[PDB]
């Protein structure tokens, strides 16, 4: 219905009850509320949508509700320059279908936790062969360790077909609540901690940067592929009385608390250098005893396992 065929810039709050097809570039400025209630189609790859929150205002909402559908082969940027402990934002991407073969970038200046913000990616169906980014354009410090403003991906019982890349590079923490699938996908934890509380975790590789962490709140039956493991990061597993073992032939790290967690970290690690310790983590406002594994060594030069 609404077709953007020439570079367009719109001002103020926007509520799209029509299907929106963008083949050029659409820019949304000076609005505290951007709503796409039906189709939002961005194609071909050179097309783009950029939603800029109104500056120096209290609340910001970007919404793709369950009535909507997202089909992006170009570039969708959601940017909010508002920052500070009183910031309230609601970036709620919950379309019936979320199909991305291009780039989606969440670019926020308010990345600290708070009491009231929501950052949600939880459609019914999730399809990503491109790149989804969460980046910071702020400089906030002194996080209050609250439960709001934590990017939460998926939900219990729904799946996420991640054939491409999810880049997490903005905040102290992120939550993965849905079931990831597809063998080619990667989740890159470039800053902060990733907490996983999901029914299963299939196919993807979790790549940890330095001074990041992966924490599984509940064990999954799948072996979880994690790469980048070295003295700069850790894998945490919820539960008390933690023990662990590393198999040099398969490259699999097995952690046992009250449940069994299995991580494929690669071959080449020396198990005699590894150690573990009990700590306490916070997840969705509750404290959990957690067993941490520190490999205490660099990434091996060759991660391949013997046949």
Swiss-Prot record:
Subcellular location: Secreted, Cell wall
Disulfide bonds: 267-305
GO molecular function: cell adhesion mediator activity; extracellular matrix structural constituent conferring tensile strength
Keywords: Cell adhesion, Cell wall, Disulfide bond, Glycoprotein, Secreted, Signal
Glycosylation sites: 207
A GO-annotated cellular component: extracellular region
Gene Ontology process terms (BP): cell adhesion; extracellular matrix organization
Induction note: Induced during biofilm formation.
Role, per record: May play a role in cell adhesion.
Protein name: Adhesin AWP1
Upper classification of the organism: Eukaryota, Fungi, Dikarya, Ascomycota, Saccharomycotina
From-to range in the entire protein, with total length: 18 to 324 of 870
């Amino acid at each position: 219905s609404l077709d953007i065929l020439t570079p367009t810039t719109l001002t103020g709050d926007q509520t799209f009850n029509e299907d929106v097809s963008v083949v050029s570039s659409l820019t949304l400025n000076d609005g505290s509320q951007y709503l796409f209630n039906n189709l939002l189609q961005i194609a071909p790859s050179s097309a783009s949508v950029t939603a800029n929150a109104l500056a120096a205002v209290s609340v910001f909402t970007f919404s793709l509700p369950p009535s909507s559908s997202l089909s992006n082969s170009g570039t969708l940027i959601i940017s909010n320059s508002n920052t500070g402990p009183s910031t309230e934002q609601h970036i709620v991407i919950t379309p019936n279908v979320m199909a991305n073969t291009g780039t989606i970038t969440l670019s926020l200046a308010h990345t600290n936790t708070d009491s009231s913000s929501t950052l949600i990616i939880d459609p019914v169906t999730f399809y990503n062969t491109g790149t989804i980014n969460y980046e910071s354009i702020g400089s906030e410090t002194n996080d209050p360790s609250l439960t709001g403003n934590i990017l939460s991906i998926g939900s219990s019982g729904r799946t996420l077909q991640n054939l491409g890349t999810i880049n997490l590079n903005a905040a102290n923490s992120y939550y993965l609540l849905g079931t990831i699938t597809e063998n080619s996908g990667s989740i890159n934890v470039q800053k902060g901690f990733l907490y996983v509380n999901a029914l299963d975790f299939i196919g993807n590789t979790i790549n940890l940067s330095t001074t990041t962490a992966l924490a599984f709140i509940s064990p999954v039956s799948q072996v979880v592929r994690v790469r980048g493991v070295f003295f700069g990061n850790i894998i945490a597993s919820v539960g008390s009385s933690g023990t662990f073992s590393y198999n040099t032939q398969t490259g699999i790290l097995t952690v046992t608390t009250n449940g069994v967690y299995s991580y494929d970290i690669g071959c080449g690690y020396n198990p005699a250098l590894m150690s573990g310790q009990q700590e306490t983590l916070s997840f969705q406002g509750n404290l959990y005893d957690t067993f941490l594994v520190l490999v205490n060594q660099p990434i091996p030069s060759d991660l391949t396992c013997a046949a």
